[PDB]
Design an enzyme around this catalytic site. Structure first.
Site, PDB file in Angstrom:
ATOM      1  CE  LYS A  22      -3.676  -2.114  -0.721  1.00 12.31           C
ATOM      2  NZ  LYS A  22      -4.822  -2.525   0.118  1.00 12.31           N
ATOM      3  CB  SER A  40      -3.628 -10.513   1.926  1.00 15.43           C
ATOM      4  OG  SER A  40      -2.396  -9.866   2.156  1.00 15.43           O
TER       5      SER A  40
END
Ligand SMILES: [Zn+2]
Ligand SMILES: [Zn+2]
Ligand SMILES: [Zn+2]
Ligand SMILES: [Zn+2]
Lengths: 291, 291, 291, 291
Positions: free
Chosen positions: C35, C255
């Protein structure tokens, strides 16, 4: 600029020749050769010691001179080179493009003739001779850059490192790192011309493998890290340089052909899982007139 | 090997010329020019489509041909080039070293003459023309490699990107990325010869800036990303190429001189904190005979 | 500093799981997740438009908050983050270390409460919302950095790219590049939780797969690049994350186990020489109390 | 995989703390610390000598355990680690994720109990002890990777290198390279806790600065490269680690705050253009419950 661009060069595996041979491509340096590394180190040393008030004069077979000229052009040093008239004409042109001065010396006198003239010019102009054959910073450049790079690029598994001896900087610096890590588990092989086998205990002589075989044993050559010496014939070196371009697409110079020809002889003496590394000192476009 | 070596080239700041100008050094590619990128992309595309049964024939001003020849040498493709007789003789020699075939076309016919002959040879031999002037993979090479590299290397702050147009691949791919990120906050400037100002709405003509100004507007040129066109005189380009070597130690070609001369005119029109980026397509040793 | 550190992350091959799978390690980013890239791009864009004079407010329960806090810390932006108070003590601590102001909203409720509170903070303070689910610069970060990296790192050979959809930024931007280069030669596979399979046409549900499955279709999701959707059970994800640590020595987050679990399902439907790439968004040490 | 991922970490300049300081970020290593380098070197050496047939046992309370566990996991070595049972639940968890067998020894006692238990496990199982405090390959990892990296990353200009001594590996190996290049032009500064200043000639004591100050002089410490010792209080270290997160966005561990606190003290005694480099051994998220 120069500090940042020099070094960190890639390695390729020569699958279309022998998949046990990995070639470090020094033409990626901004001066187009391996000699950018020792040139940078010797220059930074001489600057910090305050020796360059009148610039630099250095004898060269071509590549060290080009590296010194390039760095001098950027850093603002006057650069004078002496070089035998027998080195490729591309060398002379590059030095001129870089705004360096050049004095050509007699071909039959070889590197010794260049050194002699450089000593004269140094006295006449006060320019400082870095002295690539005696300067320990030549070895430190390969001990602190080339060797560490090679060690990691080969994933810390090397059976043999093979290199031509010019100044002896490369094999000495790289050999110190590799012997440091592998001990007797790695073989360090020096390459010289069959026509001038001084390292094998023979006589100096005229040869065509530009950049190697100076006709004497350099003072910086670290013999304690060298396991054997292999000789390469002139036509072997040229043939391999040509083969590298045609079969691998690698535009490499004559001494790269000599290195790879010798690395092939080393790999053949070893098993199918042998990992052999060598260096490609420079690029083919420095040799268009003769290669 | 080729996939790995091509791209990821460094950028330098030209402090001894104008510290607002950053030059991407494409000579670091294994073929010695920017054209390695589009050559790789067009070739990989044609292979996967099954078009290279009979090899490749491509017209060239030199660099695309060298890149194709190099990749063909490694991958095992027969490579034929057509090139105007007016391009530097170094080009011809490199192509031969790489084992490519070469057909020289008349100088006064320029790039159109080369294309015509390439179309003939393609029909006669069945060799596939990648067609650098029409192939969208030329643009994709710069959209997916050169542009992303430039964007990050300049820390996402660029006021202008300046590039010569040859095929138009570079300015189109790079311009798409940069307009994508900056919008109207970045100026994209095309460079062409004053002697052949077709992009400015003028007539084609003979000029000395090898690698740019083909005398027509390429089909792949993405005009929607181009803000202005600047012209450079032949002697301006040569002078700057020479200045780059002497003051920066950068051994760059003629079109690099043209790019930097134009980037200097751009930077002068902007403020003291302007960040201007350009490309150095190739190296000076490809031009020893004329530069 | 941040422009330089973010991106250019390594890929590894998962030899102990399936040697057809390659894993891009985004934990190497200074913020420890993927991110960092969209946060950087969204913030640079907002700065450039003069939108950050009163700081940044963003509703986020995951890695976007860390990335924003980190970039905000270095660049000197006030960062307010809204988060349901159900968020772990691990994450709160890190956000607080980076000097973010944490606004905890009523829990079981959820992310909607955080969005609503951010909208009012934006009104009351003038702080600017980046809105990661709607901001195209999230997609561009991947189109201009992650995708270009992957294309080259895989030596331009990819049969499938597999990625969990959180914001949909990663899959859209990478997908654009890979579709651009490969066309229908590459399969782009979106991953989502079996408990919340909204992209497969099903209903939103609660799940434990951190970082994916928001329970709606994000605005920025480029559906035109996605070929198929695959689901992963919560325990498949946790089990694979554990296995990656145990057998590959890769300290990757939840994830990442989801992505690799999915990529494994993809690879098994393909040939022995298939090349499948996926992403490891973050690191294990962010989940010590649940993994 | 591990040979490729370990090392080649970035440096940043600490503009918000003191712009004369540069910080090498070792958290970018796959194991999240500097110890990946010595662990790799010690393990490769032991493998090569055929010493790992019954696995590895090592007494370690810190990052060396993670590095060993991680490399052991990927390479397929059994890894047993002995640790006083006083070690955090955070660290135990990570070690267990990597499949290490944890041998907890009686607490308040301390690291001696762990050493003693490792010696008996080595006898009972045949497992090989690397002994990080005595193994020269710890020093070589830094001599051959970290030091070469730093030299170049600082563009061959360093007035001081500042580093906490844990094993003494980092300072010895980097110090060897930097002394080799700079001689007396560089100051090598060792860092230790004020509570345990054994290198300064004082007595061992309990302290909270993770990763440094073992309370003896390690065998591998190259004292010949160290110019001075500086002490840091526990709260100086924790405060600077917090400040690095808050003002630089750098999620660094406790030893990093200690190093930077020390480097700050060093820099302040030098000129405005001084260049000081130091190391950030690990990351903040390993210390969420105490930092
Ligand atoms: Zn290899
Ligand atoms: Zn710059
Ligand atoms: Zn791979
Ligand atoms: Zn710096």
């Amino acid at each position: 600029m120069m500090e940042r661009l020099i070094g960190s060069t890639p390695i390729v595996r020569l699958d279309s020749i022998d998949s046990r041979i990995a070639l470090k491509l020094e033409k990626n340096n901004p001066g187009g050769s391996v000699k950018d590394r020792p040139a940078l180190f010797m220059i930074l040393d001489a600057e910090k010691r305050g020796l360059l008030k009148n610039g630099i004069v250095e004898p060269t077979s071509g590549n060290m001179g080009i590296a010194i000229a390039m760095i001098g052009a950027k850093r603002g040093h006057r650069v004078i080179l002496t070089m035998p008239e027998t080195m490729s004409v591309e060398r002379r042109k590059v030095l001129k493009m870089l705004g360096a001065e050049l004095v050509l010396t007699p071909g039959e006198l070889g590197m010794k003739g260049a050194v002699e003239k450089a000593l004269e010019i140094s006295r006449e102009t006060g320019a400082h001779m870095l002295n690539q054959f005696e300067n320990p910073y030549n070895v430190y450049s390969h001990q602190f850059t080339t060797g560490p790079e090679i060690l990691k690029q080969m994933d810390y598994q090397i059976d043999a490192f093979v290199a031509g001896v010019g100044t002896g900087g490369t094999i000495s610096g790289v050999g110190r790192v590799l012997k440091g890590f592998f001990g007797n588990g790695v073989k360090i092989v020096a390459v010289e011309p069959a026509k001038s086998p001084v390292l094998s205990g023979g006589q100096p002589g005229k040869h065509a493998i530009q950049g190697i075989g100076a006709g004497f044993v350099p003072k910086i050559l670290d013999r304690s890290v060298i396991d054997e010496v292999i000789t390469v014939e002139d036509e072997e070196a040229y043939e391999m340089a040509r083969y590298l371009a045609k079969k691998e697409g690698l535009l490499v110079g004559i001494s790269s052909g000599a290195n790879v020809a010798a690395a092939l002889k080393v790999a053949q003496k070893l098993g199918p899982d042998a990992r052999v590394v060598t260096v490609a000192p420079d690029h083919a476009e420095r040799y268009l007139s003769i290669l």
